[PDB]
Amino acid sequence: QVQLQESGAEVMKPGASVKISCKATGYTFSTYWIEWMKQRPGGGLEYIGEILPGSGSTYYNEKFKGKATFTADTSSNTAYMQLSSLTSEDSAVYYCARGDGYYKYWGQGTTLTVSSASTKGPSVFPLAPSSKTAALGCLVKDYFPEPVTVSWNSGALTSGVHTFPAVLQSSGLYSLSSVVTVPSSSLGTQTYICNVNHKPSNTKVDKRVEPKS
Amino acid sequence: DIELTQSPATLSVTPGDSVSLSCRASQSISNNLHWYQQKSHEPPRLLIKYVSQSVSGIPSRFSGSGSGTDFTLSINSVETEDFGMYFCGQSNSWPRTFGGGTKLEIKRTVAAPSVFIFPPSDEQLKSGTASVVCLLNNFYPREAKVQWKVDNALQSGNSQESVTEQDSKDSTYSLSSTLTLSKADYEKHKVYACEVTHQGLSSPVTKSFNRGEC
C-alpha cells in the first residue's frame, strides 16, 4: 500500500528558507524517484525536480536551480525539498509524487505562505439579522495567517451555513465571513453563537449574534 | 520544453450529459499523455494513463483518446461528483509539464439569489472602520453584478467580493460583497444600498438600510 505523507503548512518572512518533507511508505524508498511540483492558487502544476533517494541523483527544472534543493534519507524513508531566499512568488501548494511513469501516488500537499505580515488574531463582529427566513453571521476580520475555522452553536447548527474563502486585504491581513440562514421567527427567542478559532494566535471567540434593538 | 494546451478552460455540464475535453501538445510526446482530476484542496488523482489506458479505481465513465498532438478526455454521462479541475500531463521528457486545466462546473436550473445587507457593527465602528456586507445566497449561475450605492452615489474600488465553491447540496453559489470605509466616511452618509443584478431576477434587487433607523 504505497503512501506519501507531506509535512505541515509553513508561513515564512521573505528571504527565509523552508524545508518540506515527503515521507514515503509501502516500498523500498531507494528504487523510485520522488518528484516535486508547485501549484499556485488557481493555477496549473509546475515541475520543480526529482530525486532518487538511494543514489541521491537529482534533476532540476532549470527555472528552480537557484530555488529548490532536494535531499533524501533512505533510513527514514523521507525526502526533502528546501526552498531558499523566499518571496511571495513562492507562495503555493507543493506536492511530492512517486515516479511511476504517470503520477499515481501523491502527497497530500503542503501550503507555503510567504508574507511581510506578522501573526495577528482576528476581530469578530456580528452580521446582525435584518429589521425585517433571515440571515445572520460573523465577520472575522484582520488576521494572519490562514486558517480560521468557524462553527455555529458548537456544530449543532450546520444546515444553511456558508463560510466564505478568506480575502487577502491591502494590509496583508486576511478577512472572512461566515453566514447562516435561519427562520425569521427564531431571531427574538433564541441564541446564535459563532465559534471562531484562529490557532496561530490562540484566538478562540464565541460571539453572540443578536438583532440590534 | 513541451507545452500542453487545454480547451475549453471552463465547461458547465448538466449531469447525464457527455463531455469531450481537449488537450493539445506543442510537439509529439509518444503515448506518454495522462489525465488527472483534482478537487479543491486535494492532490490531483490519476484518471487515464498512456493516452487511453484504464487506471485502477477510476469509474468507467471516464475514457481518454487521441494521437500525435491531439488528445481528448471523454466523460460518458457526467455525474454530480465529477465537478473539478482536469489536467493533461506529459511524461515523455523532462521537465514534466501539464496543461492549464479545464474547470468542470455542474450545470443546474437558474436560481435567483437571496439578498441580505448587513450594517457594520458598533464594536467595529468604535475602532475606526466600517465593513458593510452584502450577501447573495444560493444562486446559479455564477455571473452576478453587485452595485454599492451610498446616498445614491455609486461606489467604485472600495469593495471586495468572495464566492463559495459550488454547494455540495444543490450546486449553487453564494457570494459576499464587503464595502470597507473609514468610520469617518461611513458616518458622512445615511443610506447604504446593495443592488444585485442576476439572470434569475426580473429586475435588480436592492437591499438597504438607513443609519437613522434601528
Author numbering:
A (entry chain H): 1 to 132, 138 to 218
B (entry chain L): 1 to 214
Give me lines lifted from the publication on this model.
To study the mutational tolerance of an antibody Fv, we selected 135 positions in the anti-lysozyme antibody D44.1 for deep mutational scanning. We also noticed a surprisingly large cluster of eight positions at the vL-vH interface where affinity-enhancing mutations occurred, although they were not in direct contact with the antigen. Based on these considerations, we hypothesized that the vL-vH interface may be especially amenable to the design of multipoint mutants that simultaneously improve stability and affinity in both natural and engineered antibodies. Our study demonstrates that improved interactions across the vL-vH interface may result in substantial optimization of a range of essential parameters for antibody development, including expressibility, stability, and affinity.
We iterated sequence design and backbone and sidechain minimization to promote the acceptance of even radical mutations yielding design D44.1des with eight mutations. To determine what molecular factors might underlie higher affinity in D44.1des, we expressed the design as an antigen-binding fragment (Fab) and determined its structure by X-ray crystallography in the absence of lysozyme. Despite eight core mutations, the overall agreement between D44.1des and the bound structure of D44.1, which served as the starting point for designing D44.1des, was excellent: The two structures deviated by <1 Å backbone root-mean-square deviation (rmsd) and in side-chain residues comprising the lysozyme-binding site. The mutations apparently improved various molecular aspects of the vL-vH interface including interface packing, solvation, and backbone rigidity. The main difference between the two structures was localized to the backbone conformation of CDR H2: Whereas H2 in the unbound structure of D44.1 adopts a conformation that would sterically overlap with lysozyme in the bound structure, the H2 backbone of D44.1des moves away from this position such that, even in the unbound state, the design is sterically compatible with lysozyme binding. Although it is possible that the observed conformational differences among the structures are due to differences in crystallographic conditions, we note that the mutation Trp47HTyr in D44.1des is incompatible with the observed H2 conformation in the unbound state of D44.1 and may induce the observed change in the design’s backbone conformation. Hence, the structure-based analysis suggested that the design of the vL-vH interface based on the bound antibody structure might increase the compatibility of the CDR backbones for the ligand while simultaneously improving stability. Next, we tested lysozyme binding by D44.1 and D44.1des (both expressed and purified as Fab) using surface-plasmon resonance (SPR). D44.1des exhibited nearly tenfold improvement in affinity (KD of 15 versus 135 nM for D44.1des and D44.1, respectively), with a 25-fold slower off-rate (8 * 10−4 s-1).
